Design an enzyme around this catalytic site. Structure first.
Site, PDB file in Angstrom:
ATOM      1  N   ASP A  76       8.261   1.819 -16.062  1.00 23.59           N
ATOM      2  CA  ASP A  76       8.874   2.519 -14.922  1.00 23.59           C
ATOM      3  C   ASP A  76       9.499   3.859 -15.309  1.00 23.59           C
ATOM      4  OD1 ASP A  76       8.070   0.597 -13.116  1.00 23.59           O
ATOM      5  OD2 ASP A  76       9.935  -0.548 -13.259  1.00 23.59           O
ATOM      6  N   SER A 129      20.104   7.010 -11.147  1.00 17.98           N
ATOM      7  CA  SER A 129      18.911   6.592 -11.864  1.00 17.98           C
ATOM      8  C   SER A 129      18.656   7.502 -13.058  1.00 17.98           C
ATOM      9  CB  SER A 129      17.698   6.592 -10.938  1.00 17.98           C
ATOM     10  OG  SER A 129      17.861   5.655  -9.889  1.00 17.98           O
ATOM     11  N   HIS A 182      10.594   5.563  -9.125  1.00 20.47           N
ATOM     12  CA  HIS A 182      11.031   5.390  -7.748  1.00 20.47           C
ATOM     13  C   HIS A 182      11.937   6.522  -7.285  1.00 20.47           C
ATOM     14  CE1 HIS A 182      14.168   3.507 -10.225  1.00 20.47           C
ATOM     15  NE2 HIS A 182      15.001   3.848  -9.259  1.00 20.47           N
TER      16      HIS A 182
END
Lengths: 52, 150, 150, 150
Positions: B49, B101, B27
């Protein structure tokens, strides 16, 4: 006229079947060895025993 | 040991090179601050992910080795500290948000354990979303409820 | 506050910001420096010698806010000062070369009302072309005849 | 000085702007980490391992000159002290390697006498592959047999 469409139908059917099975088992295998384990070995050797 | 993923002047995520190659959240998009490890082509894994891709021999020893050894105690974090609560790592209140992140944690011996995705609070102090490895050597996600991607 | 232009291993001109907008000269060509600053596009008005555009809203804490008066006094500048006579702006002898067209001028309180484009020498004192503002707020050029853009 | 060549991050050799214009050895390849000098077509001379190019209008003065002056004596170099005896160039053992492809040796005055290609060792002391001017303007090649260039 009927036999050409019957034969091309069954030929395209068996090849799209083998292609769909190939993509299906290819995705189902490539989301299986995603535990890669740098510092350990292969995770359980039954997986690469199935493979290689 | 740190390599950011930013896009047009704002923070979005920070990558790491662990044990022999790198990884990066999915993302988080845009610029990464190298041209060596940007030139490689990357394999994406949607279920964890994180993508993975090999780095050449130029990065043979600048990486950080990992473990699974997490006894109960306090360890160090890039913006503070953590708390081992039975496999549920957690972050003090308000600290950590957008642009955090792929931030790794680090132990008392120089070992990396956790990669982050997001966070969600429960009660007095906010829990976070972990990618970690076990004693058997396979990877785990421990995602809280309602943990949106940071 | 002054952001240069990348040409071939040198600078051609410069660019600044005002009020949430962007400057460029017509005669100044080339790639601008910053990632968020190049990606916005220029609704250009070339015969009024300014190529405006809207800046990112993360740059809302760098721009300036103005009035339109010009009382007599003295105006400081990068190469010393620029004096205020005849309702004009003229640079002394020798000072002022090539490439400085695009960079602003200032006063003691520190607000730009004027930016430089050209030059015209008659004897000692040199009269350079200045974009300034009306009390109605419309662009104004005090161009001498026989001018020369830097 | 000289300008280096960067393949995939690290050192490969050194491009010598020497004697008025640009030379770079044909043994190593790669591109230059300096933008104003690689914006033109560069012709090659594959006879004796050197490339010939231009320079822009701002490298005539600082470029170090060549005069083929040979008194037999101890010259100097960044990794030792090369000298000219018996019609040979020599350095003792355990020196150089890949990445040192094109660093020139100089003199006591501060100008170049020779540009090194590389070589190997056959004997008690290591000889070097070199491209060196002579009295008649001839770029005669002195390289012993059995020495691949560095």
């Amino acid at each position: 006229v009927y036999t050409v469409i019957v034969l091309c139908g069954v030929a395209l059917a068996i090849l799209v079947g083998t292609a769909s099975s190939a993509a299906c088992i290819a995705k189902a295998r490539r989301d299986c060895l995603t535990p890669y384990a740098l510092a350990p070995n292969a995770t359980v050797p039954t997986a690469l025993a199935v493979l290689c | 040991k740190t390599f950011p993923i930013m896009l047009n002047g704002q923070v979005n995520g920070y990558a790491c090179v662990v044990g022999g190659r790198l990884m990066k959240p999915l993302h988080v998009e845009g610029k990464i601050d190298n041209e060596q490890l940007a030139a490689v082509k990357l394999k994406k894994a949607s279920m964890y992910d994180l993508e993975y891709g090999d780095v050449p021999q130029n990065m043979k020893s600048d990486t950080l080795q990992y473990t699974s050894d997490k006894p109960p105690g306090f360890y160090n974090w890039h913006h503070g500290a953590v708390q081992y609560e039975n496999g549920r790592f957690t972050v003090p209140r308000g600290v950590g948000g957008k642009g955090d992140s792929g931030r790794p944690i680090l132990d008392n011996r120089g070992r990396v354990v956790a990669i982050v995705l997001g966070g969600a609070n429960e009660g007095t102090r906010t829990a976070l979303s972990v990618v970690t490895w076990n004693q058997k050597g396979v990877t785990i996600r421990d995602t809280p409820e309602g943990s949106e991607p940071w």
